[PDB]
Ligand binder design. Structure first.
Ligand code: CDL
Ligand code: CDL
Ligand code: CDL
Ligand code: PC1
Ligand code: PC1
Ligand code: LMT
Ligand code: LMT
Lengths: 92, 188, 345, 43, 32, 67, 66, 37, 97
């Protein structure tokens, strides 16, 4: 249960919106000096948000994969719980 | 009919927050200002550079981002190149998420990117590895060659032969429409 | 004053120097502004903006009444990826893996090298899958939804594993190596050939960590990692399916394409690399930061424990760990998705 | 090197590179003729 | 005034009178 | 208000400065208000006589003062 | 191509995603003297400019005729 | 004629307001009221 | 600031022409192979040939009195048969033979 503290923490933040479904920036003009204008936000060279809003999770997913690979190069016995539970596709 | 929602609190949040730092045991691994460059934090500073210093003597700008490992690898040799050649050029260090309008200006599409600039369009050479074949030394060699080229061309023909091009009349408005405010044009 | 409707219009405008400038701005510097009293007002501004967007859409969009969409044989990036959603996914996973990067830097047009590599990997996968199907599927006698389900289930699985490991501070601990059994202790001690140390945390941490020597605190190549994993799995007698194994191998290959520094910088640790590459818009950003803060402040004060003190401890750790792993299946029904639940059943 | 693993796979035949020089599957004169026909018919 | 210093950009665009030059340029077909 | 100051000549405004006070009706209720003729004469220092409108019976002030 | 002579603009969709697009001002005002007129409020036009403008209160039918 | 109509409406709608000394989009440039606090 | 000292308007013209040509090469490169070659070489070339021939050479409408005098065009392709009224372009030195 306290081991699944972190599962509860993850499930808490589930459908919170991201920058992948919207524009990455917005302009604000200084009202006292309209010549002055600031861009609040991030960089982006990307405009296919109407597609990426569905696969937004893949970046962190692939990061997690690369990190599981790093951990497993040292110890491959960390997945045995899930293998025994039968979540993965395995042919006993 | 095409639209994108305006923005979100996440998008407008701080792109560069702080993260925890480890104790001095994780640092112990097998593989274990700067007085010559300028870290740029503001599009005001970037514009001042590009429109005055880049007309006086050339500039070399490194556009990076924190997520990239190639930037971390390329940082130190870039600092050595700066320490070598700061007499002939100025050297700047820009983060794309902190100053995106500088990245849109230089037309950078991938990170890390070197940009050699003189006259703001008289000489603009972008060096990068869109494929993933080059290395940091290759990038620095290309940057040295480009810097030599632009210096030679500025000396060529009595200081002339390096005049600005399309920015003479475009003002980078097709690249970034927010320059209309700088030019004072209406938006009504 | 006289009545303003009795007053001559040009005389009023000659008297007034401000609204002179207002008229020059809209009717001398332009020829197409409307003849309304206030052209700068919000209704006019928003009408102009909507007209702008509608005009550009009608001109550029792919529609049943196309103006510019015509004589199309080689499509641009946006239309190509909008029509071919299969290729957007493939071209995007390759970009994130070949270059550890954000979707915000997704290139307009990919390189031919990347495309050719994709076709070669497609050759490999289709060969293996076709030969498997030929062998087994015949002796018996919508891809978008399937791909979506597969990826959702996979990210849920890896998230659950990461949470399970963070429960005991085993998620991303390097140069440390976690151990829950004497067999694994011997196996990971064979790395440093018996050198190094072993560290412990008291009875809330249900595993013991091992520090190799600084010269052997390196990370291994992903192909070696996959080979080690698969060899261990076949030694235990639980081999993955061939399609999944090929998937792992191609992932390792595209990771090898990164080169020498594929995950970490020289003076960098894996936790720092994870926090570096982690999307800041991610909902779990604060969760991971919390975990790594706690892990750092615990490992700073972790105590050292020699070899034989652990094995007797590793027995009870194995016991309560298998008990927790048994509880895990029920715990997935608590908050895990219906996919995870049905696959546990 | 980073990309040497991928750039080793790119080795072609003489006939392959002749075919690429000529642009067999990338010029498409039938497509050019179809374009010309459609363009003239659109008058 | 010399050819060179006339056709120098600064003198050409600031101090010179380019009216006759550009009128000759426009009426070139008539002269030809 | 408009920048139309009546000429104080008697051919236009009969009896301007014959007395030391001016009066006006204000608003829909037409409230009375009395104003000193010197306070009013302060305007004719800013008045510009080149400009004359509305049958050449009204001059214009300078824009600085009017604004 | 090198990239020196590239297209000096960015597509409107990418600008819209960047939060950079501006739609307005089919017209423009070249000079700052002409830009700041509606904000000055006290000298929208200099005096010399005022007397120069006073010469064009009406169109010249005489000049039209000639 | 368009310009004539525009000015003819501007007269009636701006010349007797007491609230439009200029256009509201440029009110930042005005001096500040001493009576507000 | 219009113009710079030491630089010539002819040098600026050369600069401008270089810019235009480089931009044209870039736009031709980043274009469809299906359309650009046709629209840039084959229609211009055909139009040039036709207009030059018409505006420069001089042509004649040829007729024949009898069908027995018609030529044999069975073998040559794209014209299997004679038709009267054919426009025929000739050179100034051409004779009746
Ligand atoms: C591309 C984007 C679009 C940009 C456009 C920008 C807008 C500006 C464009 C110019 C506007 C005018 C265009 C009007 C439409 C054109 C059609 C037209 O009106 O004329 C039809 C008319 C012919 O029609 P026609 O039906 O046969 O009628 C015959 C009658 O006799 C008719 O003759 P006529 O008896 O009635 O007498 C009048 C006739 C007589 O015509 C002549 O006599 C022509 C010969 C005059 C020679 C005068 C001596 C000049 C010495 C050379 C000067 C340097 C020139 C360098 C090259 C050109 C530089 C612009 O000329 C005219 O009618 C007036 C036309 C000329 C007006 C002035 C315009 C000059 C061009 C200015 C352009 C400036 C900006 C361009 C933008 C640049 C892009 C940034 O014009 C001509 O006579 C021929 C034109 C000249 C062709 C000669 C050059 C051929 C090139 C090969 C020569 C080899 C050397 C060069 C090789 C290349 C070097 C590498
Ligand atoms: C032979 C060719 C003709 C045929 C082609 C026609 C092409 C043009 C079509 C025009 C169509 C417009 C329609 C009429 C508009 C009426 C409204 C109007 O004009 O407003 C009053 C307006 C008065 O202006 P304003 O507001 O009082 O301002 C004057 C200032 O107070 C005065 O002071 P300022 O400081 O303003 O300046 C003083 C002075 C001069 O400025 C100065 O300060 C001193 C500098 C002057 C020296 C510059 C010399 C001019 C150029 C060279 C001339 C010499 C010969 C060339 C020598 C070659 C080299 C040796 O001002 C002027 O001279 C004004 C110049 C006239 C410009 C006309 C405006 C038309 C604009 C568009 C023209 C389109 C051309 C295309 C552009 C590109 C062409 C390559 O009238 C005019 O001035 C324009 C007269 C136009 C008469 C054209 C006749 C067309 C008749 C149409 C009527 C309907 C037809 C129905 C037929 C049935 C009959 C019952
Ligand atoms: C033999 C085989 C034949 C096949 C062809 C072989 C190849 C030969 C050469 C090329 C021939 C094809 C030319 C097509 C050009 C037009 C359409 C096109 O395809 O462009 C697509 C191509 C790509 O378009 P894009 O990718 O969609 O957009 C990118 C921008 O264009 C990127 O532009 P940007 O951002 O870098 O810069 C903005 C650009 C804007 O370009 C544009 O995007 C739009 C251009 C508007 C075109 C329509 C204008 C027509 C207006 C009517 C003219 C009325 C004049 C009134 C005159 C009255 C005055 C009395 O500004 C310009 O450079 C345009 C200058 C020309 C406009 C002149 C208009 C009058 C103003 C005069 C200014 C003073 C002179 C220049 C001063 C500079 C210092 C010398 O356009 C360009 O790359 C640049 C524009 C082309 C400018 C003209 C280049 C020189 C052409 C020379 C023609 C001579 C042919 C005769 C040969 C001799 C035979 C005997
Ligand atoms: C002849 C009939 C013409 C009638 C139709 C055209 C309209 C009439 C008005 C004249 C047309 C030309 C106007 C030119 C305006 C450009 C001025 C300018 O400064 O441009 C920037 C150029 C480039 O300058 P620069 O970049 O080298 O240095 C200055 C840099 N800035 C601008 C930043 C300060 O300036 C020049 O050097 C002079 C260019 C103008 C002279 C050329 C005229 C062009 C017209 C002919 C077209 C064909 C060109 C090839 C000719 C070959 C001759 C053999
Ligand atoms: C009084 C006169 C008033 C009128 C003004 C008269 C002057 C101006 C009139 C111009 C109007 C017509 C302009 C239309 C131009 C159409 C040309 C065109 O765009 O081509 C189609 C191609 C087709 O491109 P596309 O097919 O990919 O896309 C076109 C549009 N859609 C997407 C809708 C299909 O356009 C180009 O991309 C090339 C244009 C630039 C090149 C122009 C030709 C010169 C090329 C010289 C370089 C050659 C390099 C050779 C190297 C070989 C090795 C690689
Ligand atoms: C307000 C600023 C004005 C700046 C621009 C000034 C433009 C100056 C050019 C106009 C002057 C005349 O321009 C010139 O006129 C004559 C006749 O009309 C034309 O000359 C043409 O027609 C005449 C008459 O048939 C022929 O004798 C001649 O052989 C032929 O070339 C020229 O083609 C034209 O270039
Ligand atoms: C970059 C410079 C380009 C400048 C443009 C120069 C024009 C380019 C085209 C030149 C083509 C010359 O080609 C030549 O043309 C002439 C006229 O049609 C032809 O000549 C024909 O008509 C002429 C005129 O009567 C006579 O010589 C003869 O009747 C006949 O031979 C030639 O048979 C042909 O060989």
């Amino acid at each position: 249960a306290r081991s699944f503290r972190w599962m509860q923490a993850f499930a808490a933040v589930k459908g919170k919106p991201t920058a992948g479904s919207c524009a990455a920036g917005t302009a604000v003009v200084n009202p006292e000096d309209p010549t002055k204008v600031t861009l609040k936000g991030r960089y982006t060279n990307f405009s296919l948000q109407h597609i990426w809003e569905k696969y937004d999770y893949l970046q962190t997913h692939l990061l997690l994969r690369e990190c599981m690979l790093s951990q497993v190069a040292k110890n491959p016995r960390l997945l045995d719980p899930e293998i025994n539970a039968g979540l993965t596709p395995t042919v006993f | 009919s095409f639209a994108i929602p305006p923005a979100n609190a996440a998008a407008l949040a701080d792109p560069l927050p702080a993260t925890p730092t480890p104790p001095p045991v994780f640092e112990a691994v097998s593989s274990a200002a700067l007085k010559n460059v300028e870290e740029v934090s503001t599009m005001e500073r970037y514009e001042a550079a590009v429109y005055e210093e880049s007309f006086k003597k050339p500039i070399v700008c490194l556009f990076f981002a924190r997520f990239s490992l190639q930037s971390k690898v390329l940082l130190q040799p870039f600092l050595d190149f700066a320490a070598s050649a700061s007499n002939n050029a100025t050297f700047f260090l820009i983060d794309c998420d902190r100053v995106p309008r500088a990245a849109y200006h230089a037309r950078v599409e991938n990170v890390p990117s070197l940009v050699v600039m003189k006259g703001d369009d008289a000489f603009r050479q972008t060096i990068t590895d869109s494929v993933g074949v080059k290395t940091a030394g290759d990038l620095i060699q290309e940057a040295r060659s480009a810097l030599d080229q632009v210096l030679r061309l500025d000396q060529q023909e009595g200081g002339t032969k390096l005049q600005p091009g399309v920015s003479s009349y475009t003002h980078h408005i097709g690249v970034d429409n927010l320059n209309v405010y700088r030019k004072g044009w209406p938006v009504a | 004053n006289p009545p303003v409707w009795k007053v001559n219009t040009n005389e009023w405008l000659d008297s007034d120097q401000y609204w002179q400038a207002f008229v020059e701005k809209h009717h001398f510097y332009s020829q197409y502004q409307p003849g309304v009293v206030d052209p700068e007002a919000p209704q006019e501004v928003e009408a102009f903006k909507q007209a702008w967007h509608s005009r550009m859409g009608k001109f550029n969009d792919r529609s049943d009444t196309p103006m510019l969409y015509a004589y199309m044989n080689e499509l641009p990036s946006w239309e190509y990826y909008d029509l071919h959603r299969s290729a957007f996914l493939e071209h995007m996973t390759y970009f994130l893996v070949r270059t550890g990067g954000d979707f915000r830097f997704f290139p307009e047009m990919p390189p031919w090298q990347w495309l050719a590599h994709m076709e070669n990997l497609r050759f490999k996968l289709l060969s293996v899958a076709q030969s498997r199907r030929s062998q087994l599927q015949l002796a018996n006698l919508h891809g978008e939804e399937y791909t979506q389900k597969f990826l959702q289930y996979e990210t849920e699985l890896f998230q659950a594993c990461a949470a399970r490991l963070m429960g005991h501070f085993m998620f991303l601990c390097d140069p440390f190596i976690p151990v829950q059994s004497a067999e694994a202790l011997s196996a990971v001690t064979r790395v440093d050939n018996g050198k190094g140390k072993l560290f412990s945390l008291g009875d809330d941490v249900n595993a013991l960590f091992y520090l190799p020597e600084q010269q052997r605190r390196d990370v291994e190549r992903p192909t070696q990692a996959v080979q080690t994993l698969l060899g261990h799995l076949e030694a235990t007698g639980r081999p993955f399916n061939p399609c999944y194994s090929e998937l792992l191998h191609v992932h390792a290959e595209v990771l090898e394409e990164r080169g020498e520094h594929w995950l970490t910088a020289p003076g960098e640790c894996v936790s720092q690399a994870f926090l570096r590459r982690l999307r800041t818009d991610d909902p779990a950003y604060e969760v991971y930061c919390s975990y790594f803060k706690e892990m750092y402040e615990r490992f700073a004060g972790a105590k050292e424990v020699s070899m034989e003190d652990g094995r007797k401890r590793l027995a009870t750790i194995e016991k309560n760990a298998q008990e927790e792993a048994a509880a895990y299946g029920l715990a997935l029904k608590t908050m895990g998705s219906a996919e995870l639940a049905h696959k546990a059943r | 090197r980073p990309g040497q693993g991928s750039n080793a796979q790119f080795q072609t035949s003489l006939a392959d590179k002749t075919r690429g020089l000529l642009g067999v599957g990338f010029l498409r004169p039938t497509k050019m003729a179809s374009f010309a026909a459609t363009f003239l018919l659109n008058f | 005034v010399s050819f060179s210093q006339f056709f120098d950009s600064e003198y050409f665009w600031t101090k010179a009178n380019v009216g006759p030059f550009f009128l000759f340029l426009f009426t070139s077909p008539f002269w030809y | 208000m408009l920048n139309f100051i009546p000429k104080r000549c008697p051919s236009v405004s009969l009896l301007f400065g014959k007395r030391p006070v001016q009066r006006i009706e204000v608003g829909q209720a037409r409230h009375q208000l009395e104003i000193p003729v010197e306070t009013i004469e302060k305007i004719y220092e800013g008045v510009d006589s080149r400009l004359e409108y509305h049958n050449k019976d009204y001059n214009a002030m300078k824009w600085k003062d009017f604004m | 191509p090198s990239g020196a002579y590239r297209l000096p603009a960015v597509d409107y969709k990418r600008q819209l995603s960047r939060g950079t697009l501006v739609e307005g001002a089919d017209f423009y005002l070249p000079t700052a003297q002409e830009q700041q007129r509606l904000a000055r409020h006290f000298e929208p036009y200099s005096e010399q400019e005022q007397e120069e403008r006073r010469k064009f209160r009406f169109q010249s039918i005489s000049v039209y005729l000639a | 004629g368009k310009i004539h109509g525009a000015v003819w409406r501007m007269k009636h709608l701006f010349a007797t307001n007491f609230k439009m000394v200029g256009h509201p989009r440029y009110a930042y440039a005005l001096p500040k009221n001493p009576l507000l606090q | 600031p219009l113009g710079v000292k030491g630089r010539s308007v002819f040098a600026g013209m050369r600069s401008f022409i270089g810019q235009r040509l480089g931009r044209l090469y870039d736009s031709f490169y980043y274009s469809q192979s299906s359309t650009k070659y046709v629209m840039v070489f084959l229609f211009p070339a055909g139009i040039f040939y036709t207009r030059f021939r018409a505006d420069t050479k001089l042509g004649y409408h040829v007729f024949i009195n009898e069908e027995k005098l018609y030529p044999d065009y069975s073998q040559n392709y794209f014209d299997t048969k004679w038709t009267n009224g054919r426009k025929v372009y000739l050179d100034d030195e051409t004779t009746v033979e």
